[PDB]
Design a protein around this ligand. Structure first.
Ligand SMILES: Nc1nc2c(ncn2[C@@H]2O[C@H](COP(=O)(O)OP(=O)(O)O)[C@@H](O)[C@H]2O)c(=O)[nH]1
Ligand SMILES: Nc1nc2c(ncn2[C@@H]2O[C@H](COP(=O)(O)OP(=O)(O)O)[C@@H](O)[C@H]2O)c(=O)[nH]1
Ligand SMILES: Nc1nc2c(ncn2[C@@H]2O[C@H](COP(=O)(O)OP(=O)(O)O)[C@@H](O)[C@H]2O)c(=O)[nH]1
Ligand SMILES: Nc1nc2c(ncn2[C@@H]2O[C@H](COP(=O)(O)OP(=O)(O)O)[C@@H](O)[C@H]2O)c(=O)[nH]1
Ligand SMILES: [Mg+2]
Lengths: 294, 294, 270, 279
């Protein structure tokens, strides 16, 4: 291909605009896996992120292994529709022995979704397929303030090459500002030491400095100190905002000074949902496929 | 009275029907799918008749109306003759016309049939000349001049053009014609004329050579305009003048600065009528006879 | 005096902080801190004992249990704790049976266990059920909600009701105990104490400033907890329970209930 | 707002950014006989110069690869040319090199897709085929029908009338009507933009597109230099919808339905080829 100077305006630069229009006509789809111990606030965070209390109301098809719960929902906003599928763990970390066999159903669900896509792709009478591959994995770290636990490192190292790993510190309201920074530093050093790679939002060419700086901050602030609340509380100023009320204070979900909830919502939905799907289909799925077929 | 015979050869869509109707100043020849001497000086003494054809089993004739279901059928090659009286100064004019050239997947049969028809007329005259009870007033059917209609490609000659012009040259004078010259700008037409002359020189196409010394200026001007670039039209405007009406302007055919049509008409029915006739019957026919009597 | 107190819970539940807040001094440090390699290399629960003297001259012994619920495999997380408690009971029995018995037998028996339950609003886990099943029968277990400030007052009420229902379900003996030798006022006090058990504790060894007033608590981007405020956490209630009202009864019940049961079983067997 | 909205409405914009970063590719075949303004047309469309002995020619495929850029969007253009097609006395089976090239690109992509490691992808599946018809004024020829019928089943076929400035409005209307009637009767499937819609219907009503091309500019009379053909009797303005359908064809190929051409090439033509090959 030889670069040629074109005089005037031909109009092939409208190809992204066409993709923009078609993407509105046909909907968007997303698959989000939630890994965390029971009672850590996975369900509440899902209700908060998508402003919908019925987020896990449609369940779609002794105990010594984790139970997976798949839920399907449709979110409509300004004519754009999202078919969301939330996979949510149940029993993670509550077994006396939390060995691999206990949490293997999560990895099996991921591999089965990749297998379904691969089988549809290799069919002779090949037809359009519903993309069910897990697009993001939110791992919920307990707000202990000390370090990542052995089970945390084991699962994260066994899932980082299959999903866009997004570690978050759950119920971070209880942590002081200093405890948040120390815990995040320790977690990042541990993940670096164990060669666990997280999702780094991409930077675009000819992009505003605010967008690129925002993306660099989204990666630097990991793990996000998050809080969950789809319920309205009255703060001391008299305003009715989303949050939680305690005898010691009212924490607000949508306040950037209280948590990294807006950074999580930007990475997952507002700014890099499509880039998460792109990494899932072009890198993670392709590596899984190449490993299986070579 | 003078018997004159003119062949109009070329691929379909070159304005042969328009040229014939404009030449006679009356629509005697209908156009393709559209199958009366309104000119007082023209009379139809023998209507259009097939003189030689070569088609396939059940192939619609050149007169067949538009049938989309049968458009896939190759038309073969068909040759027609129409005898008219023009205007002793009267001219018994026989217009021979080709149909099917350029429309067959293999056009070899076209040149084969054109040569068969021309050579059959030579054989008829030779058989009459060889007879004991001869008739000097015998109906001469030899083609005296032939106009080969070149498609407005803008590059030069193609294999069919060379094959047919060389095939016809053996029996009659050939005049290559740049048809539908309104398909070119002045620069494009000049370049196309130079390119065609380059090809006729390269492929030894024996086209007619326009050449006491009083005739220097006239004949040189005829040799400079080779091939004659014509613009024809068989449709008139409200004022009764032949024109072509495009959304961007009207071409009046009578204007001499656009086309060599009037020059071509004066060559055919004025200056060179007897030159073409003499060269055909006293040089080309005589060479054919000499070969036959080896 | 000699009081022996144990803290049982996962690393980072504020066990060392709660002990230091209760006794207003830096008695013990976090067995692990912000380091995973600090966890027992044995991959089991280990006993970390420390001795201190505070002023009545009370000799406090603190027993931390690093490794309890801090590994992948916690199927034997409670066994070292049970072994330690039973070893102290057996040691006292050996010193008691001695013909030339010491006048002042050193009491190493664990007198109180502060059991830190995670504030996740969920029923007792496999680990918590197994550990409490064994421990409640051999030591005074004082269930506590570690980092109770995670829960709103409604979440705290619901979780405390759930935990009390779990105790009734499993027939766990939870301190304080009642006996026929108690007065109607003492039974009332045990009833109120029991109503707020597990304690919604919050601990802090650092001071904060609010409106120019200094408090012992925690201050953050959104909150301000005063640990000594009874209308924020039950720290004051647990401190009164442990060091003032039931300290003598804790030592008393350790001797007359747990040690006696241990002794009777051990002698019936031999 | 309580609650502040989710960013679902930003998902289209996110896709826009992805597309604008990964660029695009467009492959177009210019089928037709010589002297139909195919080189001039391609240079007029992209407003640049992409394309600059024996009497009997061979029907061969010539690929011109170019990288264009406008508004920071990069398009890799493959222009497939068909020199020798229909330029001889015997043009029997002149369509075979063309259909073989199309099928070969489909087959090559099919076998690249099956590789264990398929990172690099040399995609050369033809997204559009412009068949240039000489403006004879009558109808379609046997070679035209045969070639178009065979190309229609393997690539997006867009019949066009070459040098539409050589026919009057009435002649052009009749020729377009006869071409449409032949395309319908011979069951030749031509690419039509989706109707999900008035603009698209106007684009379809103009098919076969009447093309005029020029790489020169002349004064339109209002002091502006417009791309046009300068005849001594008038100026033929390429951008004028009353002179030719170039603007409509540009809308179909690049400005509006380029994505539809590429997607129909991948999801229909290629998918049919693969299914028939693997069965
Ligand atoms: N402290 C605190 N509690 C939370 C938070 N999010 C949810 N919770 C509470 O934690 C409990 C468990 O939450 P739930 O959504 O059921 O968690 P899941 O079992 O992991 O899906 C409930 O009482 C919630 O109200 C948070 O950010 N902070
Ligand atoms: N551009 C142009 N078109 C012409 C000219 N003469 C005729 N036409 C038109 O072009 C087509 C040629 O058809 P026709 O004259 O029947 O030609 P034939 O098939 O070669 O006999 C018709 O639509 C005519 O109206 C001319 O000089 N220039
Ligand atoms: N929110 C909150 N944080 C606490 C509380 N008690 C301790 N912390 C903090 O949480 C972490 C717990 O660690 P530490 O007190 O050493 O606990 P241990 O490892 O269980 O002994 C430290 O960073 C403490 O500052 C409490 O009641 N609430
Ligand atoms: N009348 C007319 N001539 C054109 C048009 N487009 C190109 N030409 C000219 O006709 C010839 C066509 O040559 P070219 O563009 O190389 O055609 P190709 O062989 O089909 O690629 C050249 O002389 C051009 O200047 C058009 O729209 N109308
Ligand atoms: Mg839940």
């Amino acid at each position: 291909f030889i670069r040629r100077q074109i005089n005037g305006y031909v109009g092939f630069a409208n190809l992204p605009k066409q993709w923009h229009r078609r993407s509105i006509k046909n909907g968007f789809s997303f698959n989000l896996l939630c890994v965390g111990p029971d009672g850590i606030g996975k369900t509440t965070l899902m209700k908060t992120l998508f402003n919908n209390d019925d987020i896990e109301a449609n369940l779609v098809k002794q105990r010594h292994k984790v139970k997976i719960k798949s839920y399907e929902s449709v979110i409509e906003e300004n004519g754009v529709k999202l078919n969301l599928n939330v996979i949510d763990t149940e029993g993670f970390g509550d077994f006396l022995n939390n060995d691999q066999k206990s949490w293997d159903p999560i990895i099996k669900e991921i591999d089965s979704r990749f297998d379904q896509y691969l089988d549809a792709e290799n069919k002779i009478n090949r037809h359009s397929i519903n993309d069910k591959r897990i697009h993001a994995c939110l791992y919920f770290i307990e707000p202990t303030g000390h370090y990542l636990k052995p089970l945390d490192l084991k699962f994260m190292q066994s899932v980082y090459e299959k999903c866009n790993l997004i570690p978050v510190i759950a119920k971070s309201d209880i942590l002081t500002d200093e405890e948040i920074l120390s815990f995040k530093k320790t977690i990042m050093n541990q993940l670096i030491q164990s060669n666990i790679e997280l999702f780094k939002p991409p930077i675009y060419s000819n992009d505003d400095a605010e967008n690129s700086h925002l993306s660099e901050r989204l990666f630097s602030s990991l793990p996000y100190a998050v809080i969950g609340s789809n319920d309205i509380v009255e703060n001391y100023s008299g305003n009715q905002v989303r949050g939680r009320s305690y005898p010691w204070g009212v924490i607000e979900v949508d306040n950037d000074n209280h948590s990294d909830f807006n950074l999580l919502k930007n990475l997952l939905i507002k700014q890099f949902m499509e880039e998460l799907k792109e990494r899932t289909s072009k890198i993670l799925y392709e590596n899984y496929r190449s490993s299986k077929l070579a | 009275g003078i018997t004159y015979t003119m062949l109009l050869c070329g691929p379909a869509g070159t304005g042969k029907t328009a040229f014939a109707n404009n030449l006679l100043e009356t629509k005697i020849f209908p156009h393709k799918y559209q199958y009366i001497s309104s000119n007082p000086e023209v009379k139809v003494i023998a209507p259009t008749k097939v003189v030689s054809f070569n088609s396939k089993n059940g192939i619609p004739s050149y007169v067949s109306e538009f049938d989309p279901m049968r458009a896939n059928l190759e038309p073969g090659i068909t040759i027609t003759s129409t005898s008219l009286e023009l205007g002793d100064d009267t001219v018994f004019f026989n217009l021979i016309m080709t149909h099917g050239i350029g429309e067959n997947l293999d056009d070899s049969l076209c040149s084969e049939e054109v040569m068969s028809y021309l050579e059959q007329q030579f054989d008829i005259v030779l058989a009459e000349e060889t007879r004991i009870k001869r008739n000097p007033r015998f109906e001469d059917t030899r083609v005296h001049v032939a106009l080969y209609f070149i498609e407005p490609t803008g590059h030069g000659l193609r294999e069919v053009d060379v094959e047919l012009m060389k095939s016809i040259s053996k029996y009659t004078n050939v005049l290559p014609i740049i048809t539908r010259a309104d398909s070119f700008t002045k620069e494009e037409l000049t370049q196309f004329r130079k390119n065609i002359m380059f090809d006729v020189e390269r492929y030894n196409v024996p086209i007619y050579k326009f050449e006491d010394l009083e005739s220097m200026e006239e004949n040189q001007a005829l040799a400079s305009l080779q091939p004659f670039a014509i613009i024809t039209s068989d449709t008139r405007d409200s004022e009764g003048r032949y024109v072509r009406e495009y959304p961007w302007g009207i071409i009046s055919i009578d204007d001499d600065k656009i086309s060599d049509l009037k020059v071509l008409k004066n060559v055919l029915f004025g200056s060179h009528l007897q030159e073409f006739k003499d060269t055909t019957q006293n040089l080309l026919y005589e060479n054919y006879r000499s070969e036959k009597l080896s | 005096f000699q009081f022996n107190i144990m803290v049982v819970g996962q690393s980072g539940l504020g066990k060392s902080t709660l002990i230091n807040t209760l006794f207003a001094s830096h008695l013990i440090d976090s067995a692990t801190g912000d380091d995973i390699s600090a966890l027992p290399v044995t991959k089991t629960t280990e006993m970390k004992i420390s001795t201190h003297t505070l002023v009545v001259r009370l000799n406090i012994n603190v027993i931390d249990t690093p490794g309890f619920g801090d590994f992948i495999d916690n199927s034997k997380a409670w066994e070292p704790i049970v072994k330690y408690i039973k070893e102290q009971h057996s040691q006292y029995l050996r010193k008691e049976l001695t013909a030339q018995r010491e006048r002042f037998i050193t009491d190493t028996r664990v007198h109180a266990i502060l059991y830190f339950l995670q504030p996740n609003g969920k029923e007792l886990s496999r680990l918590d059920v197994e550990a409490l099943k064994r421990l409640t029968e051999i030591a005074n277990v004082i269930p506590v909600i570690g980092k109770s400030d995670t829960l709103t007052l409604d979440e705290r009420t619901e979780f405390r009701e759930l935990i009390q229902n779990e105790f009734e379900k499993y027939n766990f003996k939870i301190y304080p105990y009642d006996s026929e030798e108690l007065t109607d006022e003492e039974l009332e006090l045990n009833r109120s104490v029991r109503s707020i058990i597990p304690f919604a504790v919050v601990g802090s060894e650092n001071e904060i400033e609010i409106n120019g007033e200094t408090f012992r608590g925690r201050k953050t981007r959104w909150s301000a907890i005063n640990v000594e405020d009874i209308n924020q956490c039950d720290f004051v209630y647990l401190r009164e329970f442990l060091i003032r009202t039931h300290l003598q009864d804790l030592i008393e019940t350790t001797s007359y209930i747990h040690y006696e049961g241990f002794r009777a079983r051990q002698l019936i067997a031999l | 707002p309580v609650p502040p909205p989710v960013g679902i409405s930003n998902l289209p914009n996110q896709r826009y950014k992805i597309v604008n970063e990964e660029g695009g590719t467009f492959t177009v075949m210019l089928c037709g006989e010589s002297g139909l303004g195919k080189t001039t047309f391609i240079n007029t469309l992209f407003q640049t110069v992409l394309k600059r002995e024996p009497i009997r020619k061979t029907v061969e495929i010539d690929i011109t690869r170019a990288l264009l850029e406008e508004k920071h969007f990069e398009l890799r253009v493959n222009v497939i040319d068909t020199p020798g097609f229909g330029d001889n006395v015997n043009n029997n089976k002149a369509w075979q090199p063309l259909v073989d090239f199309i099928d070969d690109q489909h087959d090559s992509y099919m076998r690249q897709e099956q590789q264990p490691y398929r990172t690099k992808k040399f995609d050369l599946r033809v997204h559009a085929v412009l068949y240039f018809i000489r403006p004879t004024g009558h109808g379609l020829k046997p070679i035209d029908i045969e070639t178009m019928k065979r190309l229609s089943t393997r690539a997006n076929l867009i019949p066009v009338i070459a040098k539409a400035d050589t026919l009057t409005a009435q002649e052009l209307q009749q020729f377009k009507s006869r071409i449409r009637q032949v395309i319908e009767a011979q069951e030749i499937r031509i690419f039509t933009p989706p109707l999900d819609v008035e603009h698209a219907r106007q684009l379809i009503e103009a098919m076969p597109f009447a093309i005029v091309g020029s790489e020169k500019k002349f004064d339109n009379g209002q002091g502006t230099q417009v791309v046009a053909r300068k005849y001594p009797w008038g100026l033929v303005e390429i951008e004028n919808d009353s002179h030719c359908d170039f603007r409509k064809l540009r809308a179909l190929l690049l400005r509006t339905y380029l994505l539809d051409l590429i997607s129909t090439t991948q999801e229909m033509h290629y998918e049919t080829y693969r299914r028939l090959r693997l069965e």
